[PDB]
Design a protein around this nucleic acid. Structure first.
Ligand SMILES: C[C@H]1O[C@H](O[C@H]2[C@H](O)[C@@H](O)[C@@H](O)[C@H](O)[C@@H]2O)[C@@H](N)C[C@@H]1NC(=N)C(=O)O
Ligand SMILES: [K+]
Ligand SMILES: [K+]
Ligand SMILES: [K+]
Ligand SMILES: [K+]
Ligand SMILES: [K+]
Ligand SMILES: [K+]
Ligand SMILES: [Mg+2]
Ligand SMILES: [Mg+2]
Ligand SMILES: [Mg+2]
Ligand SMILES: [Mg+2]
Ligand SMILES: [Mg+2]
Ligand SMILES: [Mg+2]
Ligand SMILES: [Mg+2]
Ligand SMILES: [Mg+2]
Ligand SMILES: [Mg+2]
Ligand SMILES: [Mg+2]
Ligand SMILES: [Mg+2]
Ligand SMILES: [Mg+2]
Ligand SMILES: [Mg+2]
Lengths: 117, 100, 64, 55, 88, 6, 6, 6, 6, 6
RNA sequence: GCUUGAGUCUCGUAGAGGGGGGUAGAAUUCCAGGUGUAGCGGUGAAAUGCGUAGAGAUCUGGAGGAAUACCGGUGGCGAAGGCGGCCCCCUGGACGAAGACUGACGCUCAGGUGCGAAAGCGUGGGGAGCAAACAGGAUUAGAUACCCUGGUAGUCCACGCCGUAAACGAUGUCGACUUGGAGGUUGUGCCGGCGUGGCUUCCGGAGCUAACGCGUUAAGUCGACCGCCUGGGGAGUACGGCCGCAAGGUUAAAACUCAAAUGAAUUGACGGGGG
RNA sequence: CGGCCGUAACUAUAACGGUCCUAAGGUAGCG
């Protein structure tokens, strides 16, 4: 219920899906939405548009908090990296920071085998 | 052999550092060693946190010593909880010029 | 190459103002092809940055 | 890639500065490079081929 | 390797001069010194195969120098292997 | 179908 | 080998 | 000439 | 059909 | 130089 | 006897050369919490799978293993296999500059001996990620596959074994000689310029080559020594020996059978190759 | 730790196909 004001938008842009989570500055989730949960399955789910709608729905999920400022953490290679940030600015949030938080190993773990498609 | 010891102290134990320097340099000199350079850099902002600390008290030494007493100082650093981090490096020649 | 022009004998890990020129905003070591550093100094520079990163005089990443 | 947005600036400029900084770090190339394991033989083979074509 | 002073001692002992570094006696004495020193290394470091190849070169080189000295001068050979404590 | 052949 | 599954 | 091979 | 194989 | 090539 | 081959000594240089120990940061996974709520994940599309017993996401703390982003380079080092964070200890080789020293001490090497990727094997550890086998889901006429979700050996460590790879430059080692050009890397003498060593990449001349190509790092011109070949298949198989815990390795036939097999290049045609 | 039914150009058998059921249908080896 009580007013956050300064939020953080965490964008998890995988190749298959986009998860938009809005938190307070200490990373407690306020609301979230996903491209897969915004009426987009399969090919449509992995599009910039489905990430935009996910962003818009996530803004509606946290409207009761009255968030003004967002610092944007972007993660992953996905099609919905850019469109989510644009949707949030369009949803009336003030974008103060934009950060790439994509995890990059300094070597570590062996990735899966290459797909022989 | 010549060595360039750096060690970092938990910034609470800044008071203990003149004590520490006296003790470690005494261990060098009492085995026929030299302190070529010695620079208490004091407390600096760390580039990243170490054991939840955002600062540490850096001390540079350049030392000519036998291997065994330097090995012993590395063990002293290990078992001292105040010393958060240390680097001992071989140098070719004795370093005395003012560090950066 | 600044290091051959200045005649640096060895690049010092403690000389952080110098080393900050040879890392990106990310913290990554810049290629010799970009900076124009000589191969021999690039190796010294790499070692120096890695020692400075160990001592927390430089960051490994811009995201600790 | 870490952009702090400055006072009196369009978002499209601020965002394009983020887009340009991610291109610089090569974070998306890095992610695509680490999706699947390349064998050392394959990694050396492509490294060889990249060198021969540049020449 | 042998230190500067350990090398110079051996040149003094087995050589005809301070500068007689080429003498077969000096060469064999230097090889013997380092072969003996490295017995400690390889007792500890049994799987240091790369370094051991260097040791086996020292052994082979010493064998060739001793084989040379034997057929060149048997008296000096007999003296040298007695001093250094070699079986042959 | 099925391991069994199909 | 097996047909039956093994 | 297609599906069949060409 | 045939003996030879057909 | 002798084994290395001279 | 000699010093020109081969060595030794002095000073310095570069290096992922090796062995041992320590340590750092990023990331994955797991565990325990906080916030939060209906999806997540995956694919060509799915489904299996995971999730209201609260996942996924996000934040905090913890555990553990493995590998070291960037630097990074037809860059470097090593006999080959190979070797990549940082630090220390032990240690091998190479190279250069000036001399000084020994005085043919050399080259090659059947047998012998050692080293030798990966997988594999033994004993004891370890096990994050990955992943033969295996399980389930798809695809399909079928699909014991490719794709998906899992997942055991294994991959990691110690010690011992195995001894093989397209272990390749498909090019044995050593020495000499024979137009050039452009680079990389690492020394060094001299006043950015001039040289002069080592290692290395590409192009190309004569010559060589069936051709393709090789071309001072020769596949050119020669010399020393070794290994190996003698049509294709049967077969690197059988039998015997030797080696191995085993897997197997190594040495290695014959009958019978065919009139070919093969290399390179040429013109087409063809390609779910490109323009 | 399974049945059924069909299928090879002499016959025979069935590598192969279809089918019903199962928690899974007995593998190596041996007979
Ligand atoms: C795509 C298929 O490709 C291959 O089979 C091809 C076949 O499908 C026909 O197009 C022609 O006969 C080709 O000449 C064949 O090579 C063969 N590798 C089997 C493959 N099919 C599948 N994997 C599958 O059906 O599944
Ligand atoms: K300590
Ligand atoms: K011989
Ligand atoms: K496992
Ligand atoms: K021709
Ligand atoms: K045999
Ligand atoms: K025959
Ligand atoms: Mg070394
Ligand atoms: Mg193995
Ligand atoms: Mg094992
Ligand atoms: Mg898996
Ligand atoms: Mg799989
Ligand atoms: Mg073979
Ligand atoms: Mg190889
Ligand atoms: Mg090859
Ligand atoms: Mg061969
Ligand atoms: Mg080499
Ligand atoms: Mg050529
Ligand atoms: Mg020929
Ligand atoms: Mg056999």
């Amino acid at each position: 219920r009580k007013q956050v004001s300064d939020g953080v938008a965490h964008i998890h842009a995988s190749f298959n899906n986009t998860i938009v989570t809005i938190t307070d500055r200490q990373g407690n989730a306020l609301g979230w939405a996903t491209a897969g949960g915004s009426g987009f399955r399969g090919s449509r789910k992995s599009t910039p548009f489905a990430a935009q709608v996910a962003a818009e729905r996530c803004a509606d999920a946290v409207k009761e908090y009255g968030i003004k400022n967002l610092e944007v953490m972007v993660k992953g290679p996905g099609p919905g990296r850019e469109s989510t940030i644009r949707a949030l600015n369009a949803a009336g949030f003030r974008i103060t920071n934009i950060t790439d938080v994509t995890p990059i190993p300094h070597x570590g773990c062996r990735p899966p085998k290459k797909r022989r498609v | 052999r010549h060595y360039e010891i750096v060690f970092m102290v938990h910034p609470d134990q800044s008071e203990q550092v003149p004590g520490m320097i006296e003790r470690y340099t005494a261990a060098i000199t009492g085995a026929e060693g030299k302190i070529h350079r010695l620079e208490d850099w004091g407390r600096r902002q760390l580039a990243y946190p170490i054991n939840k600390l955002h600062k540490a008290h850096y001390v540079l030494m350049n030392v000519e010593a036998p291997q065994e007493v330097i090995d012993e100082l590395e063990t002293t650093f290990r078992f001292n909880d105040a010393v958060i981090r240390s680097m001992v490096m071989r140098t070719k020649h004795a370093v005395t010029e003012a560090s950066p | 190459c600044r290091f051959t022009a200045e005649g640096v004998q060895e690049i010092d890990y403690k000389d952080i103002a110098t080393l900050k020129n040879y890392i990106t905003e990310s913290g990554k070591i810049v290629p010799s092809r970009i900076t124009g550093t000589r191969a021999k100094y690039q190796r010294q520079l790499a070692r120096a940055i890695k020692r400075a990163r160990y001592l927390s005089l430089l960051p490994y990443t811009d995201r600790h | 890639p870490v952009i702090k947005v400055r006072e009196n600036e369009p978002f499209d400029v601020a965002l394009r500065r983020f887009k340009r900084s991610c291109e610089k770090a090569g974070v998306l190339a890095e992610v695509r490079r680490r999706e699947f394991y390349e064998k050392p033989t394959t990694e050396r083979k492509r490294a060889k081929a990249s060198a021969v074509k540049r020449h | 390797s042998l230190s500067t002073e350990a090398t110079a001692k051996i040149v003094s002992e087995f050589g005809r001069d301070a500068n007689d570094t080429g003498s077969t006696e000096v060469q064999v004495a230097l090889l013997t010194a380092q072969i003996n020193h490295l017995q400690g290394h390889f007792a500890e470091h049994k799987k240091d195969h790369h370094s051991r190849r260097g040791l086996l070169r020292m052994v082979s080189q010493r064998r060739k120098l001793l084989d040379y000295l034997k057929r060149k001068d048997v008296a000096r050979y007999t003296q040298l292997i007695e001093r250094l404590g070699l079986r042959r | 179908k099925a391991x069994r052949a199909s």
